[PDB]
Amino acid sequence: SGYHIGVGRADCTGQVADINLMGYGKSGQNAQGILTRLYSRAFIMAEPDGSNRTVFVSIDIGMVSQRLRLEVLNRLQSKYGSLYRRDNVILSGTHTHSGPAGYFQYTVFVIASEGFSNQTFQHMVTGILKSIDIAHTNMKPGKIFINKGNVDGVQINRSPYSYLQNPQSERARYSSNTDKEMIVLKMVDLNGDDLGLISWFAIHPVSMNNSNHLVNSDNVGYASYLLEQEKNKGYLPGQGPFVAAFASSNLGDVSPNILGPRCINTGESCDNANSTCPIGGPSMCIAKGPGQDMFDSTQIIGRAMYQRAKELYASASQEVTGPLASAHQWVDMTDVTVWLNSTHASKTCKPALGYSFAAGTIDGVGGLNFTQGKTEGDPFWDTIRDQILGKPSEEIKECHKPKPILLHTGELSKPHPWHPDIVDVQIITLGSLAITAIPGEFTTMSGRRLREAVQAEFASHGMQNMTVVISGLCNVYTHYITTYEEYQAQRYEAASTIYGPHTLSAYIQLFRNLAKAIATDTVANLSRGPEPPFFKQIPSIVDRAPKGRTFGDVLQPAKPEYRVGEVAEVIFVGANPKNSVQTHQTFLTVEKYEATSTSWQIVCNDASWETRFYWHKGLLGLSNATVEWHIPDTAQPGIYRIRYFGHNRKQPAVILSFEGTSPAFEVVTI
Ligand SMILES: *[C@@H]1O[C@H](CO)[C@@H](O[C@@H]2O[C@H](CO)[C@@H](O[C@@H]3O[C@H](CO)[C@@H](O)[C@H](O)[C@@H]3O)[C@H](O)[C@H]2NC(C)=O)[C@H](O)[C@H]1NC(C)=O
Ligand SMILES: *[C@@H]1O[C@H](CO)[C@@H](O[C@@H]2O[C@H](CO)[C@@H](O)[C@H](O)[C@H]2NC(C)=O)[C@H](O)[C@H]1NC(C)=O
Ligand SMILES: *[C@@H]1O[C@H](CO)[C@@H](O)[C@H](O)[C@H]1NC(C)=O
Ligand SMILES: *[C@@H]1O[C@H](CO)[C@@H](O)[C@H](O)[C@H]1NC(C)=O
Numbered sequence: 231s232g233y234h235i236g237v238g239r240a241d242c243t244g245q246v247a248d249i250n251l252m253g254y255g256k257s258g259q260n261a262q263g264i265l266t267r268l269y270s271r272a273f274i275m276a277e278p279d280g281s282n283r284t285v286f287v288s289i290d291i292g293m294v295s296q297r298l299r300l301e302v303l304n305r306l307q308s309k310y311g312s313l314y315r316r317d318n319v320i321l322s323g324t325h326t327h328s329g330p331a332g333y334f335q336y337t338v339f340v341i342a343s344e345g346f347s348n349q350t351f352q353h354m355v356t357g358i359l360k361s362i363d364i365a366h367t368n369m370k371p372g373k374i375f376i377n378k379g380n381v382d383g384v385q386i387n388r389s390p391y392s393y394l395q396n397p398q399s400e401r402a403r404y405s406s407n408t409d410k411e412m413i414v415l416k417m418v419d420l421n422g423d424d425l426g427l428i429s430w431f432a433i434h435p436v437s438m439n440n441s442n443h444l445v446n447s448d449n450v451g452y453a454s455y456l457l458e459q460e461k462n463k464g465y466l467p468g469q470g471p472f473v474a475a476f477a478s479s480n481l482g483d484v485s486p487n488i489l490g491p492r493c494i495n496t497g498e499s500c501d502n503a504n505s506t507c508p509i510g511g512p513s514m515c516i517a518k519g520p521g522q523d524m525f526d527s528t529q530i531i532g533r534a535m536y537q538r539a540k541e542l543y544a545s546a547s548q549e550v551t552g553p554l555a556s557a558h559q560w561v562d563m564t565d566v567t568v569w570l571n572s573t574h575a576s577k578t579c580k581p582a583l584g585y586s587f588a589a590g591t592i593d594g595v596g597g598l599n600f601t602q603g604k605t606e607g608d609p610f611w612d613t614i615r616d617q618i619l620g621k622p623s624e625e626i627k628e629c630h631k632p633k634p635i636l637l638h639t640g641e642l643s644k645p646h647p648w649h650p651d652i653v654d655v656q657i658i659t660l661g662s663l664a665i666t667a668i669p670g671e672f673t674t675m676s677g678r679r680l681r682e683a684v685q686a687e688f689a690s691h692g693m694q695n696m697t698v699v700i701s702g703l704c705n706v707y708t709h710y711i712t713t714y715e716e717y718q719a720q721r722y723e724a725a726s727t728i729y730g731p732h733t734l735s736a737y738i739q740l741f742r743n744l745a746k747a748i749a750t751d752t753v754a755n756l757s758r759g760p761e762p763p764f765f766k767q768i769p770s771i772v773d774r775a776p777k778g779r780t781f782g783d784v785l786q787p788a789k790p791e792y793r794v795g796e797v798a799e800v801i802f803v804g805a806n807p808k809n810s811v812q813t814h815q816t817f818l819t820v821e822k823y824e825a826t827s828t829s830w831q832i833v834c835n836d837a838s839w840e841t842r843f844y845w846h847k848g849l850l851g852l853s854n855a856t857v858e859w860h861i862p863d864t865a866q867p868g869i870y871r872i873r874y875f876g877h878n879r880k881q882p883a884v885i886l887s888f889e890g891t892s893p894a895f896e897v898v899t900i
């Protein structure tokens with residue numbers, strides 16, 4: 231009668247040192263430690279008999295790459311055969327901008343990441359696989375419920391004037407320029423106890439800005455963190471049976487920095503078409519979060535989403551029932567004929583980035599003085615583009631108009647193709663719920679159009695009252711998708727619409743077709759599409775301890791006494807964190823002494839948002855590992871200690887484990 235449901239969560243955190251953070255594309259934003267862990271969260275549904283399985287995976291990562299998906303799918307086949315295929319598995323990225331880079335195959339993202347990290351890549355894959363394996367081996371008879379509600383005051387539109395380019399009658403049908411609606415998917419067993427939840431909600435996880443060097447899952451990660459910690463009472467962060475995943479949506483033009491765009495020098499509003507300031511230009515125009523710092527902003531936004539997610543979960547009553555289905559297709563997005571009429575058609579283009587891509591956003595500005603809204607090129611940069619990369623054909627220029635091409639990645643294939651041509655489109659249906667796997671970042675109106683169009687298709691073919699959600703950053707990254715009208719303004723998202731002005735119209739057409747195949751039960755009649763390619767292709771340092779010391783020894787102990795609210799800091803002689811990159815669940819623990827049992831009990835780990843782990847490189851193999859415990863006001867007085875877990879490299883090449891334990895210290899009542 232009802233579904234078999236499995237859920238799982240697994241650590242998919244790469245290395246937290248000697249690597250850049252992915253998302254902002256900032257030059258010097260390298261990882262120097264960890265604020266919280268990154269998890270892969272998998273949800274597996276099956277028919278009563280165990281047939282027709284579907285897998286949705288929400289991953290604490292900036293983007294899901296083509297290479298990541300292909301690697302994961304191959305290993306899934308090896309272990310599970312025909313159970314989990316390209317069509318019934320969705321891999322979605324939460325879009326955190328504080329995750330380790332270097333997991334792409336296409337040249338553009340390899341340049342941004344400054345290379346490819348096998349270590350980081352493999353642990354991501356095993357992390358994703360582990361989450362799936364847990365869900366697979368822990369399936370139970372149960373039911374699925376769904377609920378909807380608005381989340382207030384956690385978002386603004388970071389390109390509102392481009393939104394206004396959309397037709398009036400269309401804009402008149404909505405109350406806001408952002409999708410305030412959260413959709414919670416509730417999962418329980420037949421005994422009524424909690425299994426897990428999924429929460430779709432449109433927002434950029436960029437509350438931690440590009441000045442940050444600590445690995446974390448940002449606002450949506452913190453929301454997942456609060457949900458899991460509330461349900462899994464008595465469990466440490468990252469542990470506990472209940473699994474709570476926030477899923478990315480149409481977040482393309484949605485910012486969490488609700489104070490809005492202001493000029494750093496004057497404090498004036500720079501909410502204009504160019505996102506620029508009269509004195510200092512675009513680099514002065516920045517949107518800030520609600521908190522005292524980025525940590526506070528992240529938690530304020532994250533808590534609000536958690537609060538609404540908690541309420542909707544509790545009050546969920548509408549049951550989800552019906553058959554499971556899935557449809558997938560590979561599509562050459564460079565050559566899609568899109569119909570604007572019955573009589574009139576146009577075409578998608580070979581991938582290209584516009585001038586305004588280099589301008590960044592109010593959530594993270596570019597360094598090169600580019601401004602958003604550039605509909606014209608200049609002889610200066612056109613020259614540089616021609617001399618270095620090559621001169622764009624007249625076809626690709628005309629196809630992309632009015633976008634002025636900065637990078638014509640579609641015609642740049644050395645050493646490997648810079649941008650993908652083959653893109654995944656897929657829909658997975660759980661009864662009346664349809665999930666569209668979007669290969670990038672849909673803007674607000676883009677997601678609205680595709681949702682309703684796909685819903686309408688289902689309706690036309692007998693599947694009534696379908697709830698359709700946009701699942702962002704799925705399967706392969708193709709940057710942003712704007713509406714035709716938004717594309718004209720050529721702001722950052724529009725300049726990052728790589729297949730041209732008709733990219734959205736193509737997807738709506740493609741996804742409508744997928745929905746039709748599912749409803750008419752003719753998904754087998756869908757053409758496979760062209761298969762995507764699998765491309766094949768820091769000096770080693772021996773860690774050292776100070777003379778007369780060894781790894782894990784305390785160089786700086788904590789204060790003898792602390793009051794709640796303060797920050798306890800302990801410094802150890804350390805080794806490179808990348809040596810620890812698979813039984814290394816944490817770099818640190820905060821432990822409380824219990825006098826009655828005369829024993830130490832772990833209260834925090836490196837996944838706790840209250841703790842921070844910094845790594846600083848020294849001379850000739852020397853290095854420090856700093857653990858900070860930001861003592862919460864709710865923390866109980868007592869005797870505490872901080873421990874450190876790492877790995878050192880000796881040399882043939884051997885990795886050894888070590889531990890450090892700080893002298894006991896105390897939190898006091900005042
Ligand atoms: C990302 O968010 C952090 C907040 O967590 C921002 O840090 C802030 O940086 C600004 C400027 O760098 C600091 O403002 C002022 O800096 C002057 C330097 O002359 C200083 O003397 C003043 O005390 C004043 O505060 C601000 O203090 C600092 N805040 C914190 C908590 O460190 C950072 O600027 C943000 N980055 C981006 C790119 O938005
Ligand atoms: C590791 O920590 C120690 C102490 O916390 C740092 O030592 C300071 O080192 C500088 C020069 O390196 C000295 O001038 C200071 O007097 C030291 N302070 C103390 C309190 O001893 C050391 O520099 C750190 N090393 C790294 C690579 O971060
Ligand atoms: C990458 O790592 C995997 C497992 O960690 C290993 O099997 C593979 O050979 C590595 N590839 C390279 C090029 O080092
Ligand atoms: C088809 O598009 C053309 C181009 O603007 C337009 O002139 C024509 O009215 C459209 N057809 C219909 C039926 O609206």
Ligand SMILES: [Ca+2]
Nearest residue numbers: 265836838841
């Ligand atoms: Ca932590």
Ligand SMILES: [Zn+2]
Nearest residue numbers: 325434482671
């Ligand atoms: Zn984004």
